[PDB]
Design a protein around this nucleic acid. Structure first.
Lengths: 394, 395, 395
RNA sequence: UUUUUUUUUUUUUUUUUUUUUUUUUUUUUUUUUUUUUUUUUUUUUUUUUUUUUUUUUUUUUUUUUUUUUUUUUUUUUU
């Protein structure tokens, strides 16, 4: 009867998603140069970090080389970052040319391995680096200029630096796609955390200007977000040995997961699992069947599922609350009454049903925390006790 | 209808945890020197402990020296201190170099077997130890300076001494990463117990100056907390008799467990297992579902679970009460009302949701301990007795 | 919901607590000499006991000597005292070397089987036993000096003597680690019995000065308490005929069991098995779950459980009433109101929770002398008569 | 056998939150003690065959009455 319809909803949501796309769909690659350190000499690693910071500080650089810089800038972690790149790159938009900087002989720019083939590229980079200084009005990437000056001999001091700047990139990714500005509040809150717990050395704190230039690069290159989410899934995998370096990335991950999918998970939290009497309304049944199909769909996607928005994967559309707007309007009605932080999520969408939102508000507030409507009999609480709870709840 | 939601919560929590993370993630190892007692000689072991105390007392020693000094200083228990470190190291931050010191030939500075590579390491150690003495204005690590000169010749007094300095490190770890100041109250209260029980010899008590220099090394190095929690799990394990040495560590452990997860367990104690009538309120169902997922998650993590804050594991975030703030605010509302130990824990966090906290307080205070709502009927207590309890509780 | 939380409490309690600790944890042994009788000669055995009493009486003897002397002393019961020590010693703190002394010809010091190997040991012993005598203002260990004077040549008087002295050690162990001073009342009781019941010859009573020197040795050595509790568990096992000696010990052991865990058992004995109306309150639920977990934990620990304070096993901490203070404060409020022997136990802990203690009084006294309910309808007599009895009893 | 109708048209990105912070050894009591053989009754005994009455007898066909018989189209108003 209805079972056919429910199975048909399921059918639509999985239809044609099976199998493999034709190689005729293969997109034009773009060629990007990544200067990998490829050495354990701490001097070259820190100089390359400064070079890379400056590439992103520069308004005269192209996006193609800025992405390449972000690929050198994160990934200072491993003994062989060329393995990290080649194994986790996984992007058809990109062909990355990896250059070992080797001895890093050149003073402020990277040394070219084919020094002779073009001097103009070394000039281009030097112009970019000068532009980085001059356009930033002499202000270093760091809030203390001495951090720009000092060059590092000792591996403890190197990693203290590197992990602190990496962490400063990774705090960005959490909101770079989903609220590309206005997220300095959240990012400084997370910064406060990592320095309080002494994981990062705040001598290497980066200026809001540099962080914004990098956050913008992240908002507008998918290629670098793809690499970030690749490595973030990689280190999320359990039971491994962890160094402090990957641990802080993983930690950051917990802010990066479910990003840009607020609507979806908020209908599960403050719609489904809150389980007010309103879930018996006939109107919602289509929406409930939708969310069932979405949860199974989420499961079908597997490990990439919590990051779909950063990856800009198409399937997100299905996830959007336009697919279940009665239940979503209701759920936000609950969310905004229950959770003070849900008050501050923007719910200006065209498909807001204000009567169902007000029913959401009424289910939490007007029903007195739903206190009359105890969900389960395990407490075996007195009727009197429930009434007292409702009185205390105002 | 609802089952799919809870099973999806499960899914989210277990997603991508599976499998083993690629070697391409492997971090730059730093070099740590650990000086090790080669032999059961009391003269060696006590001088080396004094040296090691002085390395952490030093303003001029490098963190790479200091953490390896702290490793030797808390390996002094073992019949084979080199084996203890190398077997429980388990740290990709670190490459350890051991210097099994054969005969302590240099005297005040530690020896090195083939010499320092250009003599400079011995000179480095000497500078370290001088600067320790000079910066400390002559004052020893110990509260009685006679301990510093003592140059022990018998194993009985050595183990008395060692165990007492070790205990003094281990009293720190309980707060070193969770409130590294305000710690002195706890650390002295624990000190009181071990001396009252005559387990440690108070002749060897260490100065607040030295203890804070070591507490800071613990706060700022994960590599030493990794070693500590490795050995703390190791000795917590059953099915052997114990030497007083590992027993005292195990004893300390009971203060180190649950550290830095106050909020989590407090929601279990004073939200969940107290089973107030307030758990019928619809909103808390989301949070209850979360804590169920967290309990099963805790189980899934296994032996490291009680120490996840000291070992700085990402999963901790999951556990933070920001993840279930309605239940947490209510549970702290109960906790602070019921337990006169509570409320000395800081609950100034953004997600306090104080209507639910006040409902917590109004359960335990206003509902007279929730007096009416008896959970189980095996006593079948009279209404008059419940009223007497309401009177005596002072609401 | 709640079932998972209760299982989680259990999980926390048992998490780790399996497998084997790695031998990399293995503690430094301390090497100790135990002199033992080789043979069934009373002339040896009594003089060796006098020597051992004097070693413990000495101001100049080392702790390593003293513990070894306490081993010499308590092993006299058996036909193979070497076998008794070696087989029931179970301790990594220590490394026991046994000397089967042979004929005690070399004066007041014990015999050396291969002569003096340092050519100093006998002189060490001479100094020890001289300083024992001299430090004492000319006293003997015994209240009558003739006991010190009289050599023994028959087994019957030997065993009369030995048992009397061994008993005097064993009466101590019941409060050597808990309340190690103010023990004396419960060492003069405990000497009432035995003398009255004619199990000991009070000719061999020991002076308070010797008993406190031995009590101190017991408080401040774990290794001796470990040996005592090993043999105390050994003799507690049934299914065998016994000698007089072991019976006196076993009888003692009924004093030694549950020592130092007053608070734990008192929460079960008072409060919990009293099943007051107050136990139905929401407040206790955490604590009740705790006690349940502890009872099954007690079961899991098995034979050593009643002695975990004297063995100072880490787990003890778990048991401490800080782990369930609301239930405990109430339980002590019951216990002190009901039992005339309670209250003379010191309950000045920090986690006193006095509103619950006052409710513990107000149940067992204020609620009609603990007659505001009757727990179950075991016979179904009339309420009024029982209430009249409670009024006449006046709480 | 036959005789309708049967294209389409909306909506469908995102935006919050998320490290910590207290407690947490121990303390009391804990042998015993009284009673604890027996003692009386304890066969029997009365009464218990039978006896009266106990066929039958009245009445008991029938008889009156019992076809039918009148009435029975209409008419005002709107």
């Amino acid at each position: 009867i209805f079972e056919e319809a429910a199975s048909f909803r399921s059918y639509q949501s999985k239809l044609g998603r099976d199998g493999r796309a034709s190689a005729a769909t293969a997109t034009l690659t773009t060629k990007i140069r990544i200067f990998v350190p490829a050495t354990n000499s701490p001097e070259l690693r820190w100089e390359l970090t400064l070079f890379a910071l400056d590439v992103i500080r520069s308004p005269s650089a192209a996006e193609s080389m800025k992405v390449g810089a972000a690929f050198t800038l994160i990934s200072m972690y491993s003994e062989r970052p060329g393995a990290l790149i080649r194994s986790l790159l996984n992007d058809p938009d990109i062909e990355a040319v990896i250059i070992d900087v080797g001895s890093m002989v050149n003073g402020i720019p990277v040394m070219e391995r084919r020094g002779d083939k073009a001097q103009e590229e070394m000039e281009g980079l030097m112009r970019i680096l000068k532009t980085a200084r001059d356009s930033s009005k002499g202000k270093t990437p760091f809030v203390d200029s001495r951090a720009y000056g000092l060059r590092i001999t000792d591996m403890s001091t190197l990693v203290s630096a590197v992990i602190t700047i990496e962490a400063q990139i990774w705090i960005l990714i959490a909101k770079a796609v989903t609220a590309p500005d206005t997220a300095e509040e959240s990012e400084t809150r997370r910064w406060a955390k990592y320095v309080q717990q002494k994981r990062v050395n705040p001598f290497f704190a980066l200026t809001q200007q540099w962080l914004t230039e990098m956050r913008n690069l992240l908002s507008q290159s998918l290629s670098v977000r793809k690499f970030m989410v690749e490595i973030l899934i990689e280190v999320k995998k359990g039971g491994s040995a962890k160094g402090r370096a990957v641990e802080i990335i993983s930690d950051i991950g917990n802010y990066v997961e479910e990003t840009g999918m607020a609507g979806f998970f908020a209908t599960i939290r403050f719609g489904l699992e809150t389980r007010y009497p309103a879930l018996a309304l006939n109107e919602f049944q289509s929406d409930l069947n939708t969310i069932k199909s979405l949860m199974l769909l989420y499961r079908e996607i597997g490990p990439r599922a919590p990051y779909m928005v950063l990856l800009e994967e198409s399937i997100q559309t299905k996830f959007a609350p336009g697919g279940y707007p009665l239940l979503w309007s209701f759920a936000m009605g609950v969310a905004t009454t229950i959770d003070r932080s849900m008050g501050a999520l923007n719910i200006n969408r065209g498909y807001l049903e204000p009567m169902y939102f007000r029913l959401g508000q009424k289910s939490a507030r007007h029903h007195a925390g739903g206190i009359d409507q105890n969900m389960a009999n395990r407490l075996g609480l007195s009727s009197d006790q429930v009434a007292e709870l409702a009185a205390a709840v105002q």
